[PDB]
Write a protein that binds this DNA or RNA. Structure first.
Lengths: 362, 45, 131
RNA sequence: UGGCUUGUGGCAGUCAAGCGUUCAUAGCGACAUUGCUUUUUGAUUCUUCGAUGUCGGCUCUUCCUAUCAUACCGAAGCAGAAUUCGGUAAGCGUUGGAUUGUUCACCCACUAAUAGGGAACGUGAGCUGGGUUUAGACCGUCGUGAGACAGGUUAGUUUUACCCUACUGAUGAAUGUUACCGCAAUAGUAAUUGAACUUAGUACGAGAGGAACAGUUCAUUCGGAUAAUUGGUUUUUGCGGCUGUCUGAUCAGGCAUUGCCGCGAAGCUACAUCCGCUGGAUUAUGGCUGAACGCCUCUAAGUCAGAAUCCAUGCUAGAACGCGG
RNA sequence: GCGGGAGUAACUAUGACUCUCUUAAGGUAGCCAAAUGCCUCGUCAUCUAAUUAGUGACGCGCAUGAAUGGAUUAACGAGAUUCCCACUGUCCCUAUCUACUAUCUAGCGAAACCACAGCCAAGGGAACGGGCUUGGCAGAAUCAGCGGGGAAAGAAGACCCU
RNA sequence: CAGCAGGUCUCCAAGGUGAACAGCCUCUAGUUGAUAGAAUAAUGUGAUAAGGGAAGUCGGCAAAAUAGAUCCGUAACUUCG
RNA sequence: UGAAUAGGGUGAAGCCAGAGGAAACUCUGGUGGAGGCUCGUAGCGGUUUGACGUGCAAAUCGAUCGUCGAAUUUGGGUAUAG
């Protein structure tokens, strides 16, 4: 009953498909016990990268404040629209509300979405898009919600506004998003001014915190043991056992556990990557790219031309030094970081020195 | 290969020899270092 | 010590590499590296500005044979500098040295790196053409 | 083969006289034994012929510590530091080549340095078939001989689609219903080290030497993230050269010899890019008030300081955990 | 078919030569640690990051020797070792693209082939139990996967004795 | 035995390219079999590439260097073929 | 006893000529003949490697490798039976 060393990550079991295109995360990043109102996460779309030629954050370096080449995902963040701020409190059973406080006017892309009109799946009943529901009487009793003592974290059901980013569809992408803030009272009080229609981007993301890069990754294949775990080939490479593996079980006992080196789905969950440090926030048009060299390929920010398989960016973006899962077209969900490691390098803006602009190709 | 414009913080340099400084510039021009295509025909380079 | 660079793979055990200083062998060698750790099949990759160990495979008997460890100077691999300027050399070539990093010959000939002379100030003394 | 004992024996307690400068135990230990134990090395036909297929290594699937190294502590016949020895404690790290079939045997270059034991040593319907059960032929050694040998040599079969289970991915249905997502009663997880800037030329010393402790950075290596300044591929779509023949001929166009062969960018990726330690519970040990016991001292009343591991933070999830409006 | 025991040269060290026993009577030219050597990491030089091969000898011959023959000695090979030059996807180091199928579908239509049954940890035991004792655990409609057990596809074992 | 990827004597000899009867490619001249469409995983079946240059595996097995015509220049020793 | 090897490279022996040599050696060209000379197809042999073994032949298939005027290959007729 031996062991051979840990080639590949064990605990992505089961390797379940992330059906919904936007990433979810049950364990949300807990409160900013500093900022009086925030959100927990936000929204993005994966677009492309640039080489930010700047200078180091770590100030005591041997080559301190030199020229530094760096990755950056420049993800488009249009602000999300509220349907209603749901006032989750407690009861003596559990995490149960009392009322929501609706928004009056929603967006336009609420037409096609609020349903589950898809084949081999359940509906919803005729809870369609909004008429004019509970907000008038509901807005005052969320004050009385904290007076219960039985009171929990108040949240807000949101939807996107799409075309603004170059993707042309008008059926919105849904999610609930938790409201953070100072205390339970404050994430209710200041969130009354949030449900009006649209929220702020800058409430959750302060410039130069960190931002944990969760999104939905690509489904690579039905990947075998070589790529999915990390086995080799045998150098004889004949017969049956080329890209196979050896042991799955063991003689004594016959019954093993969930470590075994088999084939199946790779990637494609709502997989969480850790503290990618936020570079800058730029609202409109600032940085460019497009340089005629081989580096890595096919995602170009305002060159001569545009991006391939996305569209040219004329919106409002947030720049994360690092990355975030998906590929082109894929809609992402940027969660914030609860444990912010390094000291916040805010107040002033971070350096942009110069950047190229030409073709990307020949 | 070509006689384009190198940036201050970009550009691969080959120093094959007694430090014979060459460089790439364009992608299409890096290619003309395999094939050895001379700047006689190709005019824009 | 940090190279501050990108130190790349693809300089395994073996090494037909040229004699970089003016001692003047032919084929050198590279044996175990400084700070080894690999697997069977998996060959110990050396780098440049290092201090990996070495005998001399073939040459002539004044420069051949019996160890004195080396330091590799050149590789044709392109490496990412932090200040965005890549640099690949020409020929592989090692300076046969001594066990805490200084040349056995009088000077290095051919190109040398910037960062190789940043690491060792002893090898930086009688360098070649600093690129 | 499995069982049994521990024969043959390994380890420790240890009788402790000796001998090491004085000196039973810094160390060395005559003479050996008692308990444990199953390793050197085998006693036994108990249990087995409608199979009981071998060795060293590649690859991938566990658990313990008879402990090499990382956290925490104490002592010397130890000057700091080199040197010498013992206790708490299993989360993690544990090299590269040459002699030799080969770990054994035996040597070298480094490196922070290169552990112990079991588990059908994962282990031939994953894998090599060198090591390993027959059949050309020869020598040594023995017998009247055909031929033999507790001695060596030369060639000489790894077939095929997993019934049931372990088991890794993907869908379908159960207290009205339900697109959409947060609790954390619980399940799975991640992990290491060195050098350099610099501390400090300070402690202490005959002389070589050069400790406590900070702030700062980065390089080997792993996983997840990875598509821009890198490195390459890109039969898709464009560009260079040679031979024969047909379309009436010339010519303009085609099939065909791998993408004919010679050279880029869609589409992907690394030889590559980005990122990573909260509170709680306690042990060796040292004390604190004060006993058992006129003095005394950490424990019986009384009361505190205190270790990687422990344990939770950080991320995934059939109320028994996808909460529930 | 082709011998033993005993004694013996300056000096460490050796036996030319001599005597004695035994038998039918005791070997030349030339070569040696073998397809044959118990003893032996013998003993020495050179080579090698270590190098016993390459190549240089030593003498310490368990047990070399002329016709089913020693010995001179050129040409020829899908036959046997090493050093040396250029070099190599075998590997480092894996990625990418492509042909064909798997997925999925129609038709007709195999194959040897018939145990009640199908969790694990500890315990007793026809002696290594999913199956028996206690305790913990275990629902069904369905498909794609993968080589660990039960020990498959099969022949009355290859060892081993009558 | 077979409506089976088979055994099976043996006849004739055009053009231009390359010795011939290799290859190349058209004639006289003949023909794609007793099931089919669409996507085109894992895995078994083809090629390309940075850097290194033998370092890997029982195993230079596999894979690389090179190649014609014509001229120059070239090694021990013989059973003297 | 009957049938089959296209194509392509060399050439002793025999014999003559020309320069040269006391004479012989040497030395320059033509004429010419014997090959396990020799080379590539027919005829004809089997070294390596992958896929098959409930499948096409009761040892199969793909890639890969050898010989050929000599101890040459092959058909037919006819004879020899434990």
């Amino acid at each position: 009953k031996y062991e051979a060393p840990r080639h590949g990550h064990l605990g992505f079991l089961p390797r379940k498909r992330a059906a919904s295109i936007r990433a979810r995360v049950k364990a949300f990043p807990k409160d900013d016990r500093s900022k009086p109102v925030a959100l927990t996460s936000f929204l993005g779309y994966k677009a492309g990268m640039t080489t930010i030629v700047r200078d180091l954050d770590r100030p005591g370096s041997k080559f301190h404040k030199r020229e530094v080449v760096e990755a950056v995902t420049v993800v488009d963040t249009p602000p999300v629209v509220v349907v209603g701020v749901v006032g989750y409190v407690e009861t003596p059973r559990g995490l149960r509300s009392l009322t929501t406080v609706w928004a009056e006017h929603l967006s336009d892309e609420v037409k096609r979405r609020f349903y589950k009109n898809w084949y081999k799946s359940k509906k919803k009943a005729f809870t369609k898009y909004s008429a004019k529901y509970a907000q008038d009487g509901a807005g005052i009793e969320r004050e009385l919600a904290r007076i219960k003592k039985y009171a929990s974290v108040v949240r807000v059901l949101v939807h996107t506004q799409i075309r603004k980013t170059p993707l042309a569809q008008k059926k919105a992408h849904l999610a609930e998003i938790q409201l953070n803030g100072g205390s339970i009272s404050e994430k209710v009080d200041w969130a009354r001014e949030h449900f009006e229609k649209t929220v702020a981007v800058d409430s959750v993301f302060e410039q130069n915190e960190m931002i944990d890069a969760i999104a939905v990754t690509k489904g690579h294949g039905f990947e075998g043991v070589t790529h999915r775990w990390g086995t080799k080939k045998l150098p004889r490479k004949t017969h049956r056992g080329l890209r196979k593996v050896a042991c799955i079980g063991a003689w004594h006992p016959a019954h093993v556990m969930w470590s075994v080196a088999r084939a199946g789905q790779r990637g494609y969950h709502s997989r969480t990557s850790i503290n990618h440090k936020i570079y800058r926030v730029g609202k409109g048009d600032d940085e460019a790219n497009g340089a005629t060299s081989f580096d890595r390929t096919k995602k170009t920010i305002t060159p001569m031309g545009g991006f391939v398989h996305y569209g040219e960016i004329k919106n409002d973006f947030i720049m994360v030094k690092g990355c975030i899962p998906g590929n082109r077209k894929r809609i992402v969900t940027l969660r914030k970081s609860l444990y912010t490691n390094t000291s916040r390098k805010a107040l002033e803006e971070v350096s942009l020195k110069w950047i190229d602009t030409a073709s990307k190709f020949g | 290969f070509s006689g384009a414009k190198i940036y201050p913080g970009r550009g691969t340099l080959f120093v094959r020899g007694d430090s014979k400084i060459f460089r790439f510039q364009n992608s299409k021009s890096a290619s003309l270092f395999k094939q050895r295509k001379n700047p006689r025909r190709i005019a824009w380079t | 010590q940090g190279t501050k660079f990108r130190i790349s793979l693809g300089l395994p055990v073996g090494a037909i590499m040229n004699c970089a200083d003016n001692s003047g062998a032919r084929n050198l060698y590279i044996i175990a590296v400084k700070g080894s750790g690999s697997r069977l099949n998996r060959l110990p990759a050396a780098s440049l500005g290092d201090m990996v160990m070495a005998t001399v495979k073939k040459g002539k008997p004044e420069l051949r044979k019996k160890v004195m460890p080396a330091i590799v100077v050149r590789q044709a691999k392109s490496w990412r500098r932090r200040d965005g300027v890549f640099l690949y050399f020409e020929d592989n070539a090692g300076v046969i040295a001594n066990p805490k990093g200084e040349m056995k010959g009088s000077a290095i000939t051919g190109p040398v790196g910037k960062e190789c002379a940043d690491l060792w100030p002893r090898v930086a003394s009688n360098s070649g053409v600093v690129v």
